[PDB]
Design a protein around this ligand. Sequence first.
Ligand SMILES: CNC(=O)[C@@H]1C[C@@H](O)CN1C(C)=O
Lengths: 87, 136, 102
Amino acid sequence: MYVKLISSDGHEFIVKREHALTSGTIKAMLSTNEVNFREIPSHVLSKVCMYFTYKVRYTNSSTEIPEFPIAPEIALELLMAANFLDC
Amino acid sequence: VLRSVNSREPSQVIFCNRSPRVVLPVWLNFDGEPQPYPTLPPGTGRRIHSYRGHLWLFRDAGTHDGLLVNQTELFVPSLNVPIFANITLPVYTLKERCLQVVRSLVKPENYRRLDIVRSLYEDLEDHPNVQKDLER
Amino acid sequence: MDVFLMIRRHKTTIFTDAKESSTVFELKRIVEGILKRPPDEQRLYKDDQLLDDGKTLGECGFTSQTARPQAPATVGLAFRADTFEALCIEPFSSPPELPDVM
Ligand SMILES: CNC(=O)[C@@H]1C[C@@H](O)CN1C(C)=O
């Protein structure tokens, strides 16, 4: 039901398995219900999780989809994470 | 191969920009050449006269980011029982969304100055483009 | 209507959703299933305010338009060891200095 995603600085994020399987990368890392990210700090992985919720919510919704906000200070690191996770 | 049908059959259309972007409407003429039309500010609307069988797509006027119309990529005016064209943001991938933000913060010359994998350096300059998306 | 939350304690963060009409207690039931701790050993906070079990999340200011998917509201969590610990939420890591080219 829920999986655990651990950031590089010890923060533990707990999200639904369905939400986590958005990333094919994470699906592979689960197959063992915890994934350790040595390269992804808290301020990035938290945004990744918010995107999971965002993506599941607005995929095939037909409602006015809002912009997914990314602070300029986060963009650089979030891009690297997104690239790696194929998110 | 992807052109508007010259039907000469009038079709009233309402462009409804339901996105926080400045929308650039693009009409594909009878040769397939992308023909830009006046831009729509966010949350605004505009009534235009088009024709049945004409091909429309929509982009961010400033960055050419892809947008959706009626939950798809292509809008084709049909028989008027005004046809409504709902223009919305798609759910971009996290990677592409991050690219959009980085592109809007860094001038294209300084893409090389950023400390990232060379793969990302290429992805950054591979800007969204009308002709690029125009194939199938 | 659905509200989207981050239930946080120390270095733990749970992303989940709930109805506006659902109660604080029912949210503790969610936490129980995930962290294996009974509601009586749990305290839920909005910022610094202790939340009452009987109140709905909407009454506690968790509305569907402020607890959004892309920006979830934060609910504080505090466990009981038989006294209750203080509410403690570790901040996330700090972003690097904004690059000169940005
Ligand atoms: C002002 N209306 C137009 O420009 C219409 C819209 C599009 O169908 C193309 N077109 C033509 C060729 O008249």
